[PDB]
Amino acid sequence: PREIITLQLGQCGNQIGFEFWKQLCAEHGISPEAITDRKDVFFYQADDEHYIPRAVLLDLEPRVIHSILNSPYAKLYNPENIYLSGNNWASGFSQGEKIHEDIFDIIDREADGSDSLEGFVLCHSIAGGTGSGLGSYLLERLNDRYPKKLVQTYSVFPNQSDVVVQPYNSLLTLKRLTQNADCLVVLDNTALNRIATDRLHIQNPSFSQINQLVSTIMSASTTTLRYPGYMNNDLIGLIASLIPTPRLHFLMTGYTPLTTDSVRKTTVLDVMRRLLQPKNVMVSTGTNHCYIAILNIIQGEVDPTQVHKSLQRIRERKLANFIPWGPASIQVALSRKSPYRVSGLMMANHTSISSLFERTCRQYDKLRKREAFLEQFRKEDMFKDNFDEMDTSREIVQQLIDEYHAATR
Ligand SMILES: Nc1nc2c(ncn2[C@@H]2O[C@H](COP(=O)(O)OP(=O)(O)OP(=O)(O)O)[C@@H](O)[C@H]2O)c(=O)[nH]1
Numbered sequence: 001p002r003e004i005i006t007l008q009l010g011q012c013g014n015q016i017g018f019e020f021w022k023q024l025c026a027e028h029g030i031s032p033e034a035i036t037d038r039k040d041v042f043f044y045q046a047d048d049e050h051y052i053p054r055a056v057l058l059d060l061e062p063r064v065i066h067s068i069l070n071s072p073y074a075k076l077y078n079p080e081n082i083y084l085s086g087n088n089w090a091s092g093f094s095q096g097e098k099i100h101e102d103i104f105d106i107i108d109r110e111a112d113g114s115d116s117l118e119g120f121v122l123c124h125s126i127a128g129g130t131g132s133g134l135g136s137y138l139l140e141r142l143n144d145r146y147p148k149k150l151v152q153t154y155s156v157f158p159n160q161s162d163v164v165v166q167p168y169n170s171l172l173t174l175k176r177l178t179q180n181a182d183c184l185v186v187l188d189n190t191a192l193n194r195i196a197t198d199r200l201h202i203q204n205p206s207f208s209q210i211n212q213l214v215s216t217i218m219s220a221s222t223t224t225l226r227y228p229g230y231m232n233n234d235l236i237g238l239i240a241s242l243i244p245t246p247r248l249h250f251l252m253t254g255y256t257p258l259t260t261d262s263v264r265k266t267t268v269l270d271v272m273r274r275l276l277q278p279k280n281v282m283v284s285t286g287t288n289h290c291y292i293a294i295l296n297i298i299q300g301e302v303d304p305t306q307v308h309k310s311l312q313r314i315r316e317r318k319l320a321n322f323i324p325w326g327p328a329s330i331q332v333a334l335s336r337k338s339p340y341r342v343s344g345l346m347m348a349n350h351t352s353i354s355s356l357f358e359r360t361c362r363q364y365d366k367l368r369k370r371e372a373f374l375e376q377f378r379k380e381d382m383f384k385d386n387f388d389e390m391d392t393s394r395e396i397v398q399q400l401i402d403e404y405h406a407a408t409r
């Protein structure tokens with residue numbers, strides 16, 4: 001009975017968000033407006049026996065939000081939750097301070113509506129301006145206006161440019177994602193593509209097509225909260241299981257049934273089996289590294305006897321290389337689906353996730369060791385360098401994540 005409020009920022013933020021609410025709606029049998037599962041967690045009971053999502057659509061430009069509003073779901077969202085006011089993280093981190101008040105009026109209100117709020121989900125992108133700039137700002141404010149309230153995020157990492165400063169905004173955000181966020185579901189645009197392109201066969205994969213994937217995961221990873229059971233009914237119940245120590249709290253995901261249309265047999269076996277095949281992992285990396293915990297959420301019929309049998313085959317084929325300094329264990333979670341074949345979702349805190357952070361700095365340093373485009377960011381309270389404060393921090397994240405693969409740990 002724990003509520004979750006969702007903050008959607010920037011195009012990226014608000015587009016994976018649109019899809020997100022399109023997906024959950026389908027499941028809970030809600031129409032683009034209104035109507036045993038737990039809807040409360042993500043929805044609110046309208047003053048007309050109808051439904052509306054606990055979502056805050058924030059953007060610094062009208063284009064994207066009006067597409068949603070001039071769409072089939074315009075009637076779903078809570079009108080007073082839609083806010084509209086730069087390209088730079090500085091410009092984004094900026095206006096937030098400017099829009100602060102106007103924003104929390106919507107944030108604190110939904111914050112009231114909830115009786116037992118757990119925390120916040122922030123959909124957004126790391127590159128870009130608003131998502132990172134405004135988003136980093138919120139992540140700092142949220143960490144004060146609500147100190148106990150947990151914070152998770154679905155952060156979209158850029159593909160592999162055409163922004164020029166992605167490596168800037170990105171570092172400046174990864175910081176606020178390291179210390180001002182409890183859980184960090186990492187969505188790698190590169191990885192999303194490969195799939196869309198490969199395991200789907202689309203030469204020029206669009207964002208709609210790409211976001212269709214993200215919705216699936218954004219959707220699956222929250223099934224145990226919406227079709228609740230005895231164990232795993234708190235968001236903190238999931239994250240806790242995936243985060244032994246702080247900082248190290250960046251996860252990577254993956255889904256099994258991705259294509260086709262018949263097979264001879266598809267059991268939970270080849271479902272857990274594939275979730276470890278990196279080809280299905282939505283992140284890009286390039287011995288040593290190992291998982292720090294693994295979760296698998298299977299939907300539909302399963303009979304927990306078969307599951308023990310699947311783990312064993314893994315233990316002997318050594319398919320999963322876990323940490324050396326502790327209990328190598330993967331958690332399964334047999335969740336339901338909505339009343340409308342198997343299906344599996346993996347969420348892991350794996351070491352090589354440091355790879356993306358590394359891939360970002362090298363780009364940063366390079367662009368930094370030339371004082372590149374520093375003219376636009378230094379255009380508002382960047383009369384020195386918070387930049388350095390961030391790099392160092394991010395380096396810490398790469399330091400512990402690697403140090404995490406050492407038996408010493
Ligand atoms: N998966 C996914 N990635 C996206 C989507 N839209 C943008 N991105 C990525 O996210 C970044 C773009 O953020 P937008 O550019 O979407 O948002 P911020 O709002 O950029 O920009 P400004 O408001 O102009 O400051 C780039 O790294 C894009 O590759 C989307 O719908 N889905």
Ligand SMILES: [Mg+2]
Binds near residue numbers: 010011060061130
């Ligand atoms: Mg934008």
